[PDB]
Amino acid sequence: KSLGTLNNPATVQIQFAYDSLRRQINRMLGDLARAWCLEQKRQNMVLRELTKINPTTVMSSIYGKAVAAKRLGDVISVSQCVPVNQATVTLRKSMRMCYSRPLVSFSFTKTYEGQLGTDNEIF
Amino acid sequence: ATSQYYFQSGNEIHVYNDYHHFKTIELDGIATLQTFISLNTSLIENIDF
């Protein structure tokens, strides 16, 4: 009996090329993953620091949807955002908050008068 | 008036209402916000020619 050698001296060298290129790419991915981990750790601190100023905008961006929040302590509580329909908008042309935000009124849902906020949100 | 503050110190959470405390909760008693936008790259497979 004998072992059936095939006259294909190229299979072994093709395997080395794939194996060699696989080893280096996997090492680069590991190095990149470590760097991203450190960056995300720092970004967590910068997000907590900014939450102490304007909690509503920071929380909305994190969620991806319009929400409401209020920091009454070291734990931030998130409330639910009730929307309104475009039925009534008032834009007074005089400002006399020190008359900074315009005095506006709306109706439907409920109706009231107030000062226009930011990002199409009304008080 | 009503004053819900609930600080945190060490491995303990002290809850205060109306300038008074009545409860103590562990850290796991409250869910933790997460912000970890992360890659989902996968290592390349192994092939036997």
Binding site: G30, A33, R34, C37, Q40, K41, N44, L47, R48, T51, A66, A68, K70, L72, D74, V75, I76, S77, V78, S79, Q80, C81, V82, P83, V84, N85, Q86, F106, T109, K110, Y112, G114, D119, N120, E121, I122, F123 | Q4, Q8, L27, I30, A31, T32, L33, Q34, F36, S38, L43
Partner: peptide
């Protein structure tokens, strides 16, 4: 995208706490 809303609510609701130490995921093997 962003609809008009007059919520302005700061009552009791869901609570959330910021993490203090992020655990780094790992994928090493073999």
């Amino acid at each position: 995208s962003f609809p008009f809303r007059v919520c302005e609510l700061s009552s009791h609701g869901d609570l959330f706490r910021f993490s203090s130490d992020i655990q780094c995921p790992s994928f090493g093997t073999r």
